[PDB]
Design a protein around this ligand. Structure first.
Ligand SMILES: C[C@H](NS(=O)(=O)c1ccc(-c2sc(C(=O)NCC(C)(C)O)nc2C(=O)N2CCC(F)CC2)c(Cl)c1Cl)C(F)(F)F
Length: 228
């Protein structure tokens, strides 16, 4: 409850994210001028749907690994038992990756950084999931409008994992104390930087929750599955 303890928690989380961000934000915004050509896009469209589900799955798997390298660098998440740890990632791991996607999204041209270059949503037409593709560009566009900073995404994605409202938690009371200590540090950082406005413009939890459930439902059929 100490001010020093709260600030030390903000600093800790912001660094655990700076070390497991997969890509440097200084480079994601520097690559936006590198858009796919009309020929390179046609290559991604003629590809078989199995070829695309296999590529994207390697991307999501790799991304979910960083979200784990990030979760481990939290002095408080490791204090949870083997079971509670698995619960929070199994439910939250993918949701955090979906939040981190707003970084690689270009709100101007409505493109996303996919494999070295930025490309529109018609680049993934081979999947046949015309509707699912939109829910990502939509969810990412709303977050890219807020101008999410690295520390805000780090603090936000941290509150998506540590959530005492996850089913099957053994040390549920211990998760609440951790969730509060993060919710408190999240408010404190928005005051230091005068960012109280974004609190009422974030995606209502459950939307991010239901959105993720819709993608796994489609994802499982082609590639499996849980995953670790
Ligand atoms: C059924 C699908 N959903 S999905 O299977 O569950 C799925 C699969 C992969 C990713 C991730 S994570 C991630 C990352 O952080 N770093 C890696 C980079 C890209 C920087 O090289 N990249 C990606 C990615 O390649 N794509 C492909 C284009 C999409 F438009 C956005 C996501 C995610 Cl977010 C999801 Cl949702 C879908 F997309 F069809 F709906």
């Amino acid at each position: 409850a100490s001010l020093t303890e709260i600030e030390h928690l903000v600093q800790s989380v912001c660094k655990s994210y700076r070390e497991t961000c997969q890509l440097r934000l200084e480079d994601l915004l520097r690559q936006r001028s590198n858009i796919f050509s009309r020929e390179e896009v046609t290559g991604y469209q003629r590809k078989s749907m199995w070829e695309m589900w296999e590529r994207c799955a390697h991307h999501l798997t790799e991304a979910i690994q960083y979200v784990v390298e990030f979760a481990k660098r939290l002095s408080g998440f490791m204090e949870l038992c083997q079971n509670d740890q698995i619960v929070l990632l199994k439910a939250g791991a993918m949701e955090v990756v979906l939040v981190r996607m707003c970084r690689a999204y270009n709100a101007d041209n409505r493109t996303v950084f996919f494999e070295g270059k930025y490309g529109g949503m018609e680049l993934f037409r081979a999947l046949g999931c015309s509707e699912l593709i939109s829910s990502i560009f939509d969810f990412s566009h709303s977050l890219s409008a807020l101008h999410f900073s690295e520390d805000e995404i780090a603090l936000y994605t941290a509150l998506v994992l540590i959530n005492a409202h996850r089913p099957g938690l053994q040390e549920k009371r211990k998760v609440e104390q951790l969730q509060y200590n993060l919710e408190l540090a999240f408010h404190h950082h928005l005051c230091k930087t005068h960012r109280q406005s974004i609190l009422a413009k974030l995606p209502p939890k459950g939307k991010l929750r239901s959105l993720c459930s819709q993608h796994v439902e489609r994802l499982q059929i082609f590639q499996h599955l849980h995953p670790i």
